[PDB]
Design a protein around this ligand. Sequence first.
Ligand SMILES: *[C@@H]1O[C@H](CO)[C@@H](O[C@@H]2O[C@H](CO)[C@@H](O[C@@H]3O[C@H](CO[C@H]4O[C@H](CO)[C@@H](O)[C@H](O)[C@@H]4O)[C@@H](O)[C@H](O[C@H]4O[C@H](CO)[C@@H](O)[C@H](O)[C@@H]4O)[C@@H]3O)[C@H](O)[C@H]2NC(C)=O)[C@H](O)[C@H]1NC(C)=O
Ligand SMILES: *[C@@H]1O[C@H](CO)[C@@H](O[C@@H]2O[C@H](CO)[C@@H](O)[C@H](O)[C@H]2NC(C)=O)[C@H](O)[C@H]1NC(C)=O
Ligand SMILES: *[C@@H]1O[C@H](CO)[C@@H](O)[C@H](O)[C@H]1NC(C)=O
Ligand SMILES: [Cl-]
Length: 595
Amino acid sequence: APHLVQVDAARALWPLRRFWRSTGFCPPYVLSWDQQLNLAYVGAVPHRGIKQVRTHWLLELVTTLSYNFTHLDGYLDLLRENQLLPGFELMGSASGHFTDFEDKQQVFEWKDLVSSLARRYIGRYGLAHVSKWNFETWNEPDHHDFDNVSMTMQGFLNYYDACSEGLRAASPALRLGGPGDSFHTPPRSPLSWGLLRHCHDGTNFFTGEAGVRLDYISLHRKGARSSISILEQEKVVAQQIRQLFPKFADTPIYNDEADPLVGWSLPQPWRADVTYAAMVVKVIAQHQNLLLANTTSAFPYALLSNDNAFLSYHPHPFAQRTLTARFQVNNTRPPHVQLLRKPVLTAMGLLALLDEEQLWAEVSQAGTVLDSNHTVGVLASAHRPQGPADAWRAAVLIYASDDTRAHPNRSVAVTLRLRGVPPGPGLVYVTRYLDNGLCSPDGEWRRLGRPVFPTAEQFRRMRAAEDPVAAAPRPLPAGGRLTLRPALRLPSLLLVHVCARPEKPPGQVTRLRALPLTQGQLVLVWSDEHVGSKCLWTYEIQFSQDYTPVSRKPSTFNLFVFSPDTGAVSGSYRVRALDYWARPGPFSDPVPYLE
Ligand SMILES: *[C@@H]1O[C@H](CO)[C@@H](O[C@@H]2O[C@H](CO)[C@@H](O[C@@H]3O[C@H](CO[C@H]4O[C@H](CO)[C@@H](O)[C@H](O)[C@@H]4O)[C@@H](O)[C@H](O[C@H]4O[C@H](CO)[C@@H](O)[C@H](O)[C@@H]4O)[C@@H]3O)[C@H](O)[C@H]2NC(C)=O)[C@H](O)[C@H]1NC(C)=O
Ligand SMILES: *[C@@H]1O[C@H](CO)[C@@H](O[C@@H]2O[C@H](CO)[C@@H](O)[C@H](O)[C@H]2NC(C)=O)[C@H](O)[C@H]1NC(C)=O
Ligand SMILES: *[C@@H]1O[C@H](CO)[C@@H](O)[C@H](O)[C@H]1NC(C)=O
Ligand SMILES: [Cl-]
């Protein structure tokens, strides 16, 4: 019996927030060319699909009473250039200065450091930008990862008050949360539970007032290979917080390390391809449909982050918990680094097309209704037109996922019945499909024989599997209805995108950049902020030597590796958007490049 999926486009039930637009990593580097390419890939996810990079040890990029912020300036400028925000963990010793947060003088000094850095980047980027940053406490305070810093229970409370008063001294508009740990049953997790008590009922180190600001509560809960287990654990902790700390009943909860499995560097075949991608989507659907979609308990769940911005290493380029797959090519003159886009990163681009209202949807099999706690599920959104540059849109994202298990032998019959699409001009739909057969760079790597130092040709062949199989825009049937019967594989993802025609064509592509990889090989990366519509077929790239169109298969990811057979890359480049009705947007400013 096939899976039946119905979507009611006429039933916009409630807001749908893109709560999953976060990644993160821990340095072992942050200014290396490897990292610069990595963050270019992360920022290239369309429509701000990844917004935050939660980065450990940021205050080891400051040296020491005056401070040198050079290395921190560099990293934060790097994020800014890629339209990314720091998940700013106030974590580090300022290169050995801080050693003890029960030393009164050190507590005052920490406050002044935090004030200085906060005011510095307010000056550097503006208060409007810095007020969006999730400042956070030291990572996992109950896992004793403090190097040479003494952090007792009392020290952690003093530290927190310095963090909070230091940020306030910069501006009251800045946001601070924590503890970013797992909240195990007492007597476990004493610093986590202690922080909440302190903020709820304790005394401020600096002011002596009862209670201390806490803008959000961050936890870490990982699935041990189970998707639904993440959600189950979060509900337990959230309820405990609600009853034990009534003032925090409406305090936003973050799970900013919500991964399928602990230990990012452990090689796992399922991390290499669409298995991981589909599980990530499944976890997100479970959170929207079983936690946020008008549940009786209604916990204030606000953010979910997959901690997968790490760079992979030899001999596991694809098998680690990373958005990209790194190849250090050591036999070129000089040695260079290349990155590939893993399906999980591509999947963040499909998620990014989900809009601000959730539509009514039901999955069933043989009359039995199945919620997102099953192998097949759906998230469906609608968009209210903003101006002449956009129109009505619907995005239906369907996953087939058995968590960390793939099933190459199996095929999942699915019948999608879309109903109630509101009438409008040039209504078309476009399907985007991912599975391990057609669109897995790891799979291509292995068909090529697993080359350790891939050639230019081998990279082209691997990159040819990055994008989803996209079907050309077809007119929507009459009555605002669409019935499709795809044969989904396990794992797979299917995005059906139904768009009405906007009045104006797409806007201008902006902030084009050329980044060198090696001889005759280069990355083109751009912003899509002013494009003004999500209904895009591809981005046309043109190259001039004295402009001709660079021929490539369709892709809406804001990054392209140009690697021509001739090796001629010197000249000027320009890029523009192309919508589902073949209408071009204006060209970006031309970017020159000389090799
Ligand atoms: C081409 O050239 C590049 C640049 O020179 C080489 O890059 C090195 O690659 C190796 C992997 O082959 C890297 O070494 C590995 O680093 C891992 C992470 O290290 C950090 O984290 C650990 C643990 O937290 C710390 O101990 C460590 O100090 C670092 O902070 C380690 O996990 C690896 O060790 C594990 O595997 C080895 C097997 O070799 C076991 O012996 C160990 O017990 C352990 O299980 C490993 O050390 C290295 O960091 C890379 N250097 C750089 C600068 O990037 C490429 O290897 C080379 N390519 C080829 C094909 O030769
Ligand atoms: C998700 O579904 C699983 C089953 O697939 C649920 O786990 C079962 O829970 C019941 C409790 O009524 C137990 O009796 C069973 O032993 C469990 N079965 C298995 C296979 O583990 C789980 O409770 C569901 N979770 C949510 C949040 O709906
Ligand atoms: C700060 O550190 C940078 C990087 O190490 C170095 O180049 C510079 O000399 C330092 N600046 C000052 C003012 O000490
Ligand atoms: Cl994982």
